[PDB]
């Protein structure tokens, strides 16, 4: 039979690495239907904050207004999504945005020529002032009560060195972007993960022993750290199959086509969650699991 108790007894997690942007962990003895649900929720169901509505006041640059607003929307922000609520779209725009659901950025950059430019120079940072507009220039403007809630944590982009625009003297950009909560199933600019996928643990089943000069080339058909040689007998064996990406280079050789089969461990997933910068990958995974649980609970409490 199957039960939650049996799943708890047979379930394990092996966290291989954990950084501020990328976490690599394993889910062991879990079903593909659940691993895929976690992956999908991480990709396109975890809320994040990104620019949605842009209020241009002037744009005399080469970049058109729609392209500039889209490029601003694509920037990731270092904002904790829990610090603001969701926007009720039914309300009119006069009071649709409040102090607790919208973060108002601004950009006011005006290019002028630098009279002190060295002769024969071509560098735009010496020829001109504000020749390059960067994401770090997106100045956070606190509104209402959030001047106290965001005092410790300023609203700055995850990458401040993103090249939003370029200018030439006389050209100015003056906008004011509103960034709100949204999910990656609505727009790809909201997905809190760069990529969040998994893979089955590779399996390298050695059928017949390979020894001698043959074992030399068998090791080279894989990444160097996967296949090893036993010290006692000059055999071949699988040291670490996690270090293997399935390129099936062995199957190209008739020497080893009959001496090894390639497969997977169908209930051993190798996750890899890279975050855009708004939140840690471990928190992203936590929120995906909690989103699946709350989705199931809401469906259960819905009256059929």
């Amino acid at each position: 039979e199957w039960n939650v108790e049996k799943f708890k007894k047979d379930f394990e997690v092996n966290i291989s690495s954990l950084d501020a942007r990328e976490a690599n962990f394993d889910l062991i003895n879990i079903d593909t239907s659940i691993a895929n649900a976690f992956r999908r929720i991480m990709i396109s169901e975890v809320p994040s904050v990104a620019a949605e509505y842009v209020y241009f006041f002037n744009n005399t640059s080469v970049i058109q207004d729609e392209v500039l607003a889209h490029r601003i929307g694509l920037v990731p922000l270092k904002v904790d999504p829990d610090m603001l609520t969701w926007v009720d779209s039914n309300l009119p725009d006069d009071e649709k945005f409040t102090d607790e659901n919208t973060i108002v950025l601004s950009l006011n950059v005006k290019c002028t020529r630098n009279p002190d430019a060295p002769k024969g120079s071509t560098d735009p940072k010496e020829l001109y002032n504000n020749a390059h507009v960067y994401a770090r220039d997106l100045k956070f403007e606190p509104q209402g009560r959030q001047s106290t809630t965001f005092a410790d944590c300023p609203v700055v982009p995850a990458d401040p060195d993103i090249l939003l625009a370029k200018l030439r003297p006389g050209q100015e950009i003056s906008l004011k972007a509103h960034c709100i909560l949204g999910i990656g199933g609505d727009h790809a600019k909201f997905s809190p993960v760069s990529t969040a996928s998994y893979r089955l643990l590779p399996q390298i089943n050695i059928l017949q022993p390979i020894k001698g000069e043959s074992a030399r080339r068998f090791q080279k058909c894989f990444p160097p750290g996967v296949i090893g040689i036993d010290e006692g007998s000059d055999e071949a064996y699988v040291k670490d199959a996690r270090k293997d990406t399935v390129s099936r280079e062995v199957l190209r050789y008739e020497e080893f086509a009959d001496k090894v089969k390639l497969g997977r461990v169908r209930n051993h997933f190798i996750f890899n969650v890279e975050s855009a910068g708004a939140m840690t990958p471990e928190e992203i995974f936590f929120k995906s699991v909690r989103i699946l649980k709350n989705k199931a609970e809401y469906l259960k409490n819905c009256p059929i």
């Binding site: 379930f11 997690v13 966290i15 962990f25 659940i34 936590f286 699991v289």
Partner: protein, 98 residues
């Protein structure tokens, strides 16, 4: 509201029924299907999205008896919640340990 019983495909005794869920997809559909197929009493379970462009999910449950398709759905939802809770707890423990 969100969960809808398709009365034109439901057995008179309740042993078989078909459900329509709005704003759902493969994510919840496959998880619910897997967690319901573990019920020893269900005879037939499957999920289907009528059209990809629409946000509707269809769940079919056919029990062998002594229960209801609604009861099987409730048990599957509870077991899915328990599975999510146990994986979250194990991940939390591994994060703390490292």
């Amino acid at each position: 509201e969100k969960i809808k019983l398709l009365t034109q495909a439901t057995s008179e005794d309740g042993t078989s029924a078909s459900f329509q869920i709005v704003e759902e997809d493969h994510t919840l559909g496959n998880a619910l299907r897997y967690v319901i197929m573990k019920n020893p009493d269900v005879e037939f379970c499957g999920y289907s999205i009528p059209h990809p462009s629409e946000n509707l999910l269809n769940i079919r449950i056919q029990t062998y008896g002594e229960t209801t398709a609604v009861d099987a759905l409730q048990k599957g939802l509870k077991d899915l919640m328990d599975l999510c809770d146990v994986v979250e707890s194990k991940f939390t423990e591994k994060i703390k340990s490292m």
